[PDB]
Amino acid sequence: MVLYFIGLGLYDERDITVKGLEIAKKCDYVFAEFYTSLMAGTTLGRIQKLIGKEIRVLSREDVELNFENIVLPLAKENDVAFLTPGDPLVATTHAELRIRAKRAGVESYVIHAPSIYSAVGITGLHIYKFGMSATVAYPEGNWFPTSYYDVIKENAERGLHTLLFLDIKAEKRMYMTANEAMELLLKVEDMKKGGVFTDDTLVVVLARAGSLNPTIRAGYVKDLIREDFGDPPHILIVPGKLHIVEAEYLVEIAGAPREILRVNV
């Protein structure tokens, strides 16, 4: 009579922790959602095969409006698992689902998995130096989101790095590329003119973290804006002031222009 929130990790079915797998294998019912992120290296069947169970996939509406009608009822007489990409409680509104479980008299446990939030460490940028995070959302109709531009500004101002999650329209199979994010940001700079994001801004692109060969690229917007970083998902990072070793890693591992080695302390 329990509910397990189990993260599946970054790229494929093997990114789940051993703990998550052994527990998932023994659950009576297994649900999952794949709209909060993209696991570009696996498939549902591959996942079902590994866990050895049938997985009922839920839409954003099933979860947000009917979690307590579809999932919680079964958790009262059985052990239920709710699988999600990355870590189940990161950059999502899933934490509130634990409140729903509590109110329905269901105990819940959380099994973590690798998250893009810590995976950014592979960019060479010190993780403690990351400031507030944000999401670049697709404009819709006459609505053009821009708050993420202010986040970058506020962080950069403090010498902190900015992690930018990119938009996703799962039902439309749409995954915002770093290129599209850069285009949108230049447009916002054009509007606000704060000098926050321009053709000369240094950025870092991390694509398909979790795979053995992710694409890690660093450089000026003017040079990367049209570069092909491979299939999604992508995340964009706008570094703040760099430490010598961060610059060195970006140049040696991410192919950044050797000129960034010369930091303006």
Question: Residue 96: CB partners within 8 Å, gap ≥ 6?
Answer: none
**Phi, psi at 107, each rounded to 5°:** -80, 140
Sites for its own copies among residues 187-226 (CB under 8 A): 209-210, 212-213
Listed ranges 23-31, 152-160, 204-212, 217-225: which one lies at the site for ligand SAH (CB under 6 A): 204-212
Counting contacts by CB under 8 A, is residue 42 touching its own copies?
A: no
- Which residue, among 148, 155, 6, has the nearest Cα to 89 in the 3D structure? 6
Give the nearer residue to ligand SAH in terms of CB position, either 74 or 130: 130
Among ligand SAH, its own copies, none, what does residue 180 contact (CB within 5–8 Å per kind)? none
Q: Residue with CB nearest ligand SAH?
A: 86
CA 182 to chain centre: 17
Whether 195 contacts 216, CB under 8 Å: no
Question: What residues are paired with 32 via a beta bridge?
Answer: 57, 83
Sites for ligand SAH among residues 90-119 (CB under 6 A): 90-92, 115-118
Residues in the annotated binding site for S-adenosyl-L-methionine: 10, 87, 90, 115-116, 166, 209, 234
Per-residue binding string, its own copies, 86-105, x by CB under 8 A, is xxxxxxxxxxx-xx--xx--
Joined together, the tokens standing for residue 126 give 């010190």
Member of 158, 169, 222, 258 binding its own copies (CB under 8 A) = 158
| CA dihedral sign, ordered 115, 121, 123, 125 | positive
Counting contacts by CB under 6 A, is residue 238 touching ligand SAH?
A: no
Give the nearer residue to its own copies in terms of CB position, either 117 or 220: 117
Residues in the annotated binding site: 10, 87, 90, 115-116, 166, 209, 234
Q: What is the per-residue DSSP string for 27-40?
A: -SEEEE--SSS--T
